[PDB]
Amino acid sequence: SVKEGAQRKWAALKEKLG
Protein backbone atom coordinates (compact mmCIF):
# COMPACT_ATOMS: atom_id res chain seq x y z
CA SER A 1 0.00 0.00 0.00
CA VAL A 2 2.70 2.46 1.04
CA LYS A 3 4.54 1.69 -2.20
CA GLU A 4 1.53 2.64 -4.32
CA GLY A 5 1.15 6.04 -2.68
CA ALA A 6 4.84 6.89 -2.94
CA GLN A 7 4.65 6.00 -6.64
CA ARG A 8 2.13 8.77 -7.30
CA LYS A 9 4.45 11.20 -5.52
CA TRP A 10 7.56 10.00 -7.36
CA ALA A 11 6.17 10.60 -10.85
CA ALA A 12 4.66 13.87 -9.65
CA LEU A 13 8.03 15.31 -8.65
CA LYS A 14 9.69 13.82 -11.73
CA GLU A 15 7.31 15.73 -14.00
CA LYS A 16 8.09 18.97 -12.17
CA LEU A 17 11.79 18.57 -12.97
CA GLY A 18 12.10 18.71 -16.75
Curated annotation (Swiss-Prot):
Q: Where in the cell is it found?
A: Cytoplasm, Perinuclear region
Instruction: Spell out which residues are annotated as carrying N-acetylserine.
Output: 1
According to UniProt, the tissues expressing it are described as: Widely expressed. In the kidney, expression is apparent in podocytes and some tubule cells.
- The segments labelled Disordered in the record are 1-18
Q: Which disease is it linked to?
A: Focal segmental glomerulosclerosis 5: A renal pathology defined by the presence of segmental sclerosis in glomeruli and resulting in proteinuria, reduced glomerular filtration rate and progressive decline in renal function. Renal insufficiency often progresses to end-stage renal disease, a highly morbid state requiring either dialysis therapy or kidney transplantation.
- Function according to Swiss-Prot or TrEMBL: Severs actin filaments and accelerates their polymerization and depolymerization.
Q: How does it assemble?
A: Interacts with actin at the FH2 domain. Interacts with DAAM2.
Show the domain comment: The WH2 domain acts as the DAD (diaphanous autoregulatory) domain and binds to actin monomers. Regulated by autoinhibition due to intramolecular GBD-DAD binding.
Q: Which family does it belong to?
A: Belongs to the formin homology family.
**The protein, known as:** Inverted formin-2
Q: Which residues of the full protein are shown?
A: 2 to 19 of 1249
